[PDB]
Amino acid sequence: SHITKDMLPGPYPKTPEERAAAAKKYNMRVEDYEPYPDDGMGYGDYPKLPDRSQQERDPWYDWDHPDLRLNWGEPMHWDLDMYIRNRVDTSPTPVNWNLMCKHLFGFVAFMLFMFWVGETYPTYQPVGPKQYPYNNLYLERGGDPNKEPEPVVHYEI
Amino acid sequence: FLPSAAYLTHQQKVLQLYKRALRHLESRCVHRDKYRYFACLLRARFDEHKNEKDMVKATQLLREAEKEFWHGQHPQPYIFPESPGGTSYERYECYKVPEWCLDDWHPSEKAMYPDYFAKREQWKKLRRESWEREVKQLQEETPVGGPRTEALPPARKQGDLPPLWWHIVTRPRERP
Amino acid sequence: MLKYIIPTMMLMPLTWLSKNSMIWINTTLHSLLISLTSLLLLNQFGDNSLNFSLTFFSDSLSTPLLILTMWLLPLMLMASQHHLSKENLARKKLFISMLILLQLFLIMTFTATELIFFYIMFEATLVPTLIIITRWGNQTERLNAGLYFLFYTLAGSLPLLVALIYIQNTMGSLNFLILQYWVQPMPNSWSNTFMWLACMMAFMVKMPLYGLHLWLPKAHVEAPIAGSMVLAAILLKLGGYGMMRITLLLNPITDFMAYPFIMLSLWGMIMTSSICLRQTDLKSLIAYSSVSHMALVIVAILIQTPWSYMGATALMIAHGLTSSMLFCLANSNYERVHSRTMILARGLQTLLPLMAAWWLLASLTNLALPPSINLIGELFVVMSTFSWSNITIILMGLNMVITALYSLYMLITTQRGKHTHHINNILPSFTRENALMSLHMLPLLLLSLNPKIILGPLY
Amino acid sequence: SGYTPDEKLRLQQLRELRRRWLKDQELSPREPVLPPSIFAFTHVLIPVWIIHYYLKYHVTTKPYTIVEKKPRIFPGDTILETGEVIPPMKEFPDQ
């Protein structure tokens, strides 16, 4: 048995009674409940949350769910399928974001630029070609065993 | 965000920053003697201004301390390898079998362990034996129209055990 | 195969005049007798089919699917107690006889000579599953699920009949052999495209293709377990069977009008494997998994390669087995926690220490672990599609990565790590559930040893 | 500040209860539970016997089966079956 009214169709107009019923049904702060708004992407009148929720909330508070970081009565953020720990970990980064991405792409592009600078400038010891016996080693390349040799014998140095 | 109250205090925030900054200096500062030097330098820095009777000066220096701390924190601090974040973090959760179980066993397997099961049966009789009057009278007597706190008082009134105790006492031993 | 048909008619009234507490053993024992009897047929040798007076014949397009259905019937049946146990004896007999009738028309459907008889037995397959899922669907929109089911399958399957009557009165009778022997190509006119579009579109709706696959997931989340397994395995693989039958005629225009369907199935395969990553309602993940695999099947059927048809029937048989099993484990979990939602039922490593091994083995067969026949199917389809266009292998491998990802996420989410310490009602797993596990997977591995049977008529 | 003393009292009753529960969890009545070379080389030799019975007969009767990059005869050595030398490598000079 469960009340059909305890689901959630329809957005926030009109402003007194929708916000009253939303703060009652969702167990939230009244004027800190804010809808998405009615953007027409579905979404109902489901609450907006601060989006991180899992690498925060340090586990020494000792709430109920030991891994979901939830305490059984909350608005249960719309991305609970994805914002969990073990899927996406939104810890605060030690430095920045733009500084991180620009240094990483700068280092990788620098390595590719020097790969190309290496590819246009090869290195080699002073070493000539090999001197294969049977005219650059016929009969064990592609074939024609008695048909077309190209005679180039080596002359000594 | 804490079970006792909502605001920590200014002093509690200063103190938590003190513990975190000292732990980060521990992580920065191996060989432990230069650690002792820099740690007492930090203790000197916070006893620069013991005599602070102002409040806006204290909180603005606290915000600048958060600035100067985030400017120089360490990426992998030495977190203790049993705490959350660390290297264990319920490492030995392979055998933290909850204790509502060990009641659905086969009776020959229950014939294997006689006296422990007699003791568990009399604990369970103690559990249902003292639920109704004590816990219902305390949870209708002591709460105001809002409960408004999370730490709960014991059964200090007359007799037996404090309420709401089963899944707090009978937890696994953290070495199973 | 009338020696398969008439014991099914002699099995049904026995259940009617079976006494109390004795319906079960009688039906199970006699369906297992039918399983040995089904195993007798496997004889298809060499050049031709094995025919039988006009109505009946057998190919390896039909023989492993028929063996699959008659092996699936006791598994179906033994999944189908304990969730109608408190209901009436008469309603229980009615349900079991309804499933027996559904099996009878499925055997009729797979052992069909003419495509007209195939159409009759196609919507004969349609009708009982409606009543089953709408009556016993056990949620508030089993109504909507049965209604979407019936209207999509009729409204797609219906002009197929008119095209079949047109092929009837333009080429004489409609034996599969005459249509092997009197066929002639029909060039790129417009009416050829419309007739091909009607036939293939009826089957597209049955597959389901990505344009009309909202058909499926309500009918899987809002069904009992017997109808769930029947619906998924036998109805989708019956649709693919029917497409493999009809596509022998009308070869020269599928190169001109198959390019939208292949594209729609590939991009829908990627989108469906992405959508079954992030949903709730644990049951529905396997539903869109089946959608993704049948999209792969559709691409394999229409690119017209012998490697592709061998891999197609291998993927059909393997996914039928795996999806039926994984539905049965989902029903076991719903027996436990009364939820159907994914994130609630957690733990199940301390608790239930060997039910987890069957979850693991099922998810590894779904993952295409390399002795699973899923991998044999996917591998042959990948070989054929890289011969087909030499660049579409990227969509195949991206499907492969995402497939392993969502299947293994479905494993480790609910069933790796921590009970929520408020469930406290799970009993250790019954011998019946484990019996259904070892009835699913032991024939999968013992078929994986010598799998030369299940490959197609282009052996 | 410290504990409020009611929390101290609640904690003390839970120390008594946790001590008694862990004292329950220990068992040692000294009847705690109550229940109701040649092997090595036969374990090695019986697969050798089975798989060498298998690898002679069926594997030999199947023709294009186990096959070998042949051993490498040398220009000074001879043949076991037919039997003759290959003439040696020629003169050395500047060795």
Place this chain on the structure above:
Amino acid sequence: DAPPLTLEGIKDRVLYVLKLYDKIDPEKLSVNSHFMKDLGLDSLDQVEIIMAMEDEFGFEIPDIDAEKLMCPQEIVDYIADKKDVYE
């Protein structure tokens, strides 16, 4: 993987490492001795004390419990609770 502990031994260890500290005295030192109340030392040194207990016993005690212990008896009780050491 078996070091065992006791109550009396671990209490002696905590009282030992409190006695090791410089600017308190072993003169009037016992288990029933409050820190902020009647030993006169600051809360700053009190959290240096809790830091020393963490750095020896190898597990973080929470920041909510770096507030309200103030006496060695509750320290020994809390460490025996986190390590679950009774008979």
Place this chain on the structure above:
Amino acid sequence: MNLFSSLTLVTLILLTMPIAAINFNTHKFTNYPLYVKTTISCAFITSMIPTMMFIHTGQEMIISNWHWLTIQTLKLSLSFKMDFFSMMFVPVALFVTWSIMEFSMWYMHSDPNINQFFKYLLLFLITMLILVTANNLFQLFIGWEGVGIMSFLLIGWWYGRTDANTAALQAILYNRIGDIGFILAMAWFLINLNTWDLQQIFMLNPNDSNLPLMGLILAATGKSAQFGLHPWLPSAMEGPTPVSALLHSSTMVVAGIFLLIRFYPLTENNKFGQSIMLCLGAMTTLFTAMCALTQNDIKKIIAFSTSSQLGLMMVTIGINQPHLAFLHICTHAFFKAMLFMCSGSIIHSLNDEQDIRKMGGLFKAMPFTTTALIIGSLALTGMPFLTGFYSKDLIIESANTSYTNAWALLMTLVATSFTAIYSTRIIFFALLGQPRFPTLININENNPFLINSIKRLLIGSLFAGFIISNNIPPMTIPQMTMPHYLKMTALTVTILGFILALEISNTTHYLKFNYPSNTFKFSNLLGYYPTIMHRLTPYMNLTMSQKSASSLLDLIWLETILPKTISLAQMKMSTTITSQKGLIKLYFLSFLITILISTTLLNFHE
């Protein structure tokens, strides 16, 4: 002779009886580690025999039996070979894994689920063996994904600790990227060479081979934890310790370059392929060399070390030199098996605290394991001149005497200097510092099994490297003629790296506390690659799965295309047709307009 084939087949078939034994047991075993010990011991002593026959004669052979699905012009039996690589690799892996069995007897002494652990580990051994014996490429794929799945389960052993099963999820994801590359290789091999069998692919030389080589390089950088797909390796270090030793020392990470070593006749040509080889290997080598500074976990240091070693082997295949890379596999295998086992001895001896901090001083306290770590680290860089000298310095000499790319040689030189300096740092911070770790010390080696295992693997690292390296028929040209500063220069660079790390240490002795200067921050967060990619790409694809798939395009948009339009049209037509009232005058007027539209609008009598 059939003796050779028979003993290779019994070395395969001995790895089955414990698994079916415990599955058919029903009477509980407790000496199951003893059982695994004796069966792997006899497998080793029966696999040393055919390699003795191999170097005694040559005499290479392939076996094949029990064909199935001979469908089209191809066929496939269970078919595996024994040529030089599958000869002189298998006893190495068996010896390593038998020592890991010993160390897992002692280390996992406490968990009462040891039987399922040994089942997983031995099944993983079987599958890696099937990978390193097969010539039918489908069986190679079988071994590939099987060791991927066993790596998944064997990391995710400890349920709970969501970091660990996240690590296992990352591991299986990069194995599937290896899978897409490998099936592209199989697809091209089928469609342009009728089959996937190594004999026929060697028998022809299809010279246009850019597509399959790009697929193979994708598969190898997927499996071998290299640039772009490296971050699953320290995350995979966060499993247990014999887990880490077997899974990343001798198996499962060396299989990625093993296939490129297997395809040496195909890569004898295609210099473009070797350019891609050595450029990617140099990128990995310098990336992990720079990345392994200020990494206070021991296992992550060893992970970056073994990734740099695999970068050296990718450069080694960047030269047309497979057998030096194979010899380096053997030396590296004994090497880091012994090294992980010593590290696990340390970590379990101090209560799994596992970090460089709070571990500082260890010398003169059980000097057996400190001796083990210093033998391992001296064998790193090849202190002059040991088993680790041989493969590594033949690699750098053959790289310097080659038509190289002017950048890869310099990057591998700098990375050999850097592996010298982090070998210095693991020595100096684990052993010689003033002792920093808590009291109640339980530092214990009243233990036979660990001392036997460390004993046997340091004996292996002392001799068996040179023993394998010495008596092999050389399949290359020994260059042997290097100028000044081109033969002793490797030792020169490693010693100057020791000087540089020494002065780092002496500057660390002071009391200064200078700021981090963002190379220090570039090295901590692993070059920011695992952080920013694992925070960005699971945001992109999953947010698009929310927006397009699960919310918009599938459900609500298909419900508005097909059912809504039809249903609302039928609703409107019904509510306009049946919504009539009872004024029959209107119905007779409808009759009238029907008669008039029948007369004058459309002709009906005409």
Place this chain on the structure above:
Amino acid sequence: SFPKYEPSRLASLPTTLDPAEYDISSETRKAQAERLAIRSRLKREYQLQYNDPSRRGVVEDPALIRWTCARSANVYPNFRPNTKTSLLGALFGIGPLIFWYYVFKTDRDRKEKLIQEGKLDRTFNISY
């Protein structure tokens, strides 16, 4: 000392430095007190549902069932066709399909005309 650490869609802004915490007013403390009271009363009701010996089944969470029904079948209402919804659906539905369909037009034209000519590697191309 620093540019004060901007957040992003991924970079979490921690609760150490907001800096907008420090301008506390009385209504904000009233808000934190009401939040504490709400979590207090919900946990009290949770524990009283949670601590009976006679309870056998699940804890009967209404929040999870609320979220599942609000995510599964309470999406189709509400909905309206905007410019945003229609354009975004037409850009994510048929766009990539017509894109890869054009590239398969190109590759099939190349393959058809190529082996129409005869300059392919099909000296042996058996497994058709």
